[PDB]
Design a protein around this ligand. Structure first.
Ligand SMILES: [Zn+2]
Length: 168
């Protein structure tokens, strides 16, 4: 199922997710809808809190042909180093892009779809992704990194863009 993705200035985007208590079949069809919703909207990452499910689940797929879906359940950040930035977007901030300061290298622990723990070292687009998504789980959006001025115009451009969404 495709779920509805919240946009700013929705206050539910600012909620701190709870850790998943147990990875069962309820959890695994949250993951599936999250992937289906992600691909439907053409994103490379989606956090549960964006679909108004406030638990610690992130799906990511950077792939061309969808051969390596990545699931992070209860992600914890073990180490980071370096610094980069690319011009990021977000399904919850429609059509806006900004350079956000990120760590370049990141080591995480997490559970997969089967509740088995794995560790992942990531750089590049992956490491930027993981950070952006993990931010969602604690109520942080990428525009939070920007000047008060930069934030204003973002908020307005989006409001205008939904002004049309609910369309008629
Ligand atoms: Zn996002």
């Amino acid at each position: 199922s495709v779920l509805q993705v919240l946009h700013i200035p929705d206050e539910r985007l600012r909620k701190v997710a709870k850790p998943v208590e147990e990875v069962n079949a309820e959890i695994q069809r949250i993951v599936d809808d999250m992937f289906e919703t992600m691909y439907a909207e053409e994103g490379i990452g989606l956090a549960a809190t964006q679909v108004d499910i406030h638990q610690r689940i992130i799906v990511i797929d950077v792939s061309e042909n969808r051969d390596e879906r990545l699931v992070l359940i209860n992600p914890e950040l073990l180490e980071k180093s370096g610094e980069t930035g690319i011009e990021e977007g977000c399904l919850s901030i429609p059509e806006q892009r900004a350079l956000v300061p990120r760590a370049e290298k990141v080591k995480i622990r997490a559970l997969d779809r089967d509740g088995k723990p794995f560790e992942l070292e990531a750089d590049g687009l992956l490491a930027i992704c993981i950070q952006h998504e993990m931010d969602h789980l604690v109520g942080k959006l990428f525009m939070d990194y920007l000047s008060p001025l930069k934030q204003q115009r973002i908020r307005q451009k989006v409001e205008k863009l939904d002004r049309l969404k609910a369309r008629a």
